[PDB]
């Protein structure tokens, strides 16, 4: 799949404490590499992948500066959206924002995007043409009209078509041995008794990257997805992922059932079975 650089902003108001908190996480594909938290002791943009660490203080000073300016603006934006919705000032509220660029084969923008949310609900989004906005309601139309007036989309489009893709390319090189090579799952099957009329068979896939994987059980070629418990993919804690797929079989049929793993790190699709 095409590579992407994206940032997630989270602004949360605290009217009690009188302030607000601002978070940033930066991702290249499924890999986090920077973070900012305005509640941190002398908060700054910090590295969170080994390969971004080589950046000079110039890079860090800039990102830090932009983070704090942005956090500042959000402290009033939180209060503005509260006014748009005629909401009280008592409770904590939240604005979220994602934006990013997908890298094309020609080294140019494949697709740029940006979406904002208020209290977990869609607020406003940049269209695919990167020249206009879609507002989800009245309040967002106000915001939309302001961004039209001062041509906010052109700042976004210029960033996404230029700076965003160019830094992505640089990040793809800096962390090539982790971002650009696929990491196949370490797989195996476990077996767990229960009643007289059931034994749970669980297929493991561990330490894989990227996140996209395919686990499936088959009984003599026939799909068993109907009764296959499949867990949500989860992070290992070291930049890779985990997933398992299980199902209950009669206590002798173990060999009549097969797990089927597809992941782009694997050269060929796999077929595992209990031993």
């Amino acid at each position: 799949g095409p590579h992407s650089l994206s940032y997630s902003y989270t602004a949360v108001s605290r009217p009690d404490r009188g302030d607000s908190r601002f978070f940033i996480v930066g991702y290249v594909d499924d890999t986090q590499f920077v973070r900012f938290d305005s509640d941190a002791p002398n908060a700054k943009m910090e590295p969170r992948a080994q390969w971004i660490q080589q950046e000079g203080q110039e890079y860090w000073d800039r990102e830090t500066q932009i983070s704090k300016e942005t956090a500042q603006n959000y402290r009033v934006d939180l209060n503005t959206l509260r006014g748009y919705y005629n909401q009280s000032e008592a409770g904590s509220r939240t604005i979220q924002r994602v934006y990013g660029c997908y890298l094309g084969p020609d080294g140019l923008l494949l697709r740029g995007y940006r979406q904002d949310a208020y209290d977990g609900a869609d607020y406003i989004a940049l269209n695919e043409d990167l020249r206009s906005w879609t507002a989800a309601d009245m309040a967002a139309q106000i915001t939309k009209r302001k961004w039209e007036v001062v041509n906010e989309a052109e700042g976004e489009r210029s960033y996404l078509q230029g700076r965003c893709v160019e830094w992505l390319q640089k990040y793809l090189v800096m962390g090539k041995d982790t971002l650009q090579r696929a990491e196949p799952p370490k797989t195996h099957v476990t077996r767990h008794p229960s009643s007289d009329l059931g034994v749970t068979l669980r297929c493991w896939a561990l330490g894989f990257y990227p996140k996209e994987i395919s686990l499936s059980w088959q009984r003599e070629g026939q799909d068993q997805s109907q009764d296959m418990e499949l867990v949500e993919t989860r992070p290992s804690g070291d930049g890779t992922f985990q997933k398992w797929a299980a199902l209950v079989v009669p206590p002798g049929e173990e060999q009549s059932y097969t797990c089927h793993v597809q992941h782009e790190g694997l050269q060929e699709p796999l077929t595992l079975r209990w031993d």
Binding site: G26, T80, Y84, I95, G155, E156, Y159
Partner: peptide
């Protein structure tokens, strides 16, 4: 690297 756009809602 971050987009630098101070824009108010």
């Amino acid at each position: 690297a971050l987009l630098r756009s101070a824009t108010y809602y």
